[PDB]
Design a protein around this ligand. Structure first.
Ligand SMILES: CC[C@@H](C)c1nccs1
Length: 157
């Protein structure tokens, strides 16, 4: 079972748990890049009453650093915000709770805006079909093949 966060049938409860950064794509590649700060490796989701705790790490030349953020429930169902290098809101366009998770986020800081999508898996790697499916969704959001980065095997600390 597939579900949207927007969807009337979404069980947030099941987003809970261990997740993995498999692919990131941005509108602004630099964010996704080597010393970029949207370059985050999801570690786990702890679902809360109205919030979500996301613990991730960042990696500057193979050394990792742990970071936890609290995204909260905005008024719009399935959507949340979190304050990070400006103001961010995100949704989960697609998930199957047990294997993959796809996100869509909107960073808006100082009048400047950028789009970021990610493919997260329950395991460090997902199939080429998913990556591909994840790849056609980004194209429909205006992000090109040169803007998608597969972190599937660098996602390990
Ligand atoms: C900053 C929030 C981005 C990176 C995401 N984390 C997991 C769901 S969306």
């Amino acid at each position: 079972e597939e579900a949207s966060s927007t969807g009337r049938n979404f069980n947030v409860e099941k987003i809970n748990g261990e997740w993995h950064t498999i692919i990131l794509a941005s509108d602004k590649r630099e964010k996704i890049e080597d010393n970029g700060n949207f370059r985050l490796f999801l570690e786990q989701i702890h679902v809360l009453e109205n919030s979500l705790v996301l613990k991730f790490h960042t990696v500057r030349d193979e050394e990792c650093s742990e970071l936890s953020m609290v995204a909260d429930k905005t008024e719009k169902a399935g959507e949340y915000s979190v304050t990070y290098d400006g103001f961010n809101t995100f949704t989960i366009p697609k998930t199957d709770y047990d294997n993959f998770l796809m996100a869509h986020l909107i960073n808006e800081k100082d009048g400047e805006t950028f789009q970021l999508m990610g493919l997260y898996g329950r395991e460090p790697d997902l199939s080429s079909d998913i990556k591909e499916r994840f790849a056609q969704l980004c194209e429909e959001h205006g992000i090109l093949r040169e803007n998608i980065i597969d972190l599937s095997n660098a996602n390990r600390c």
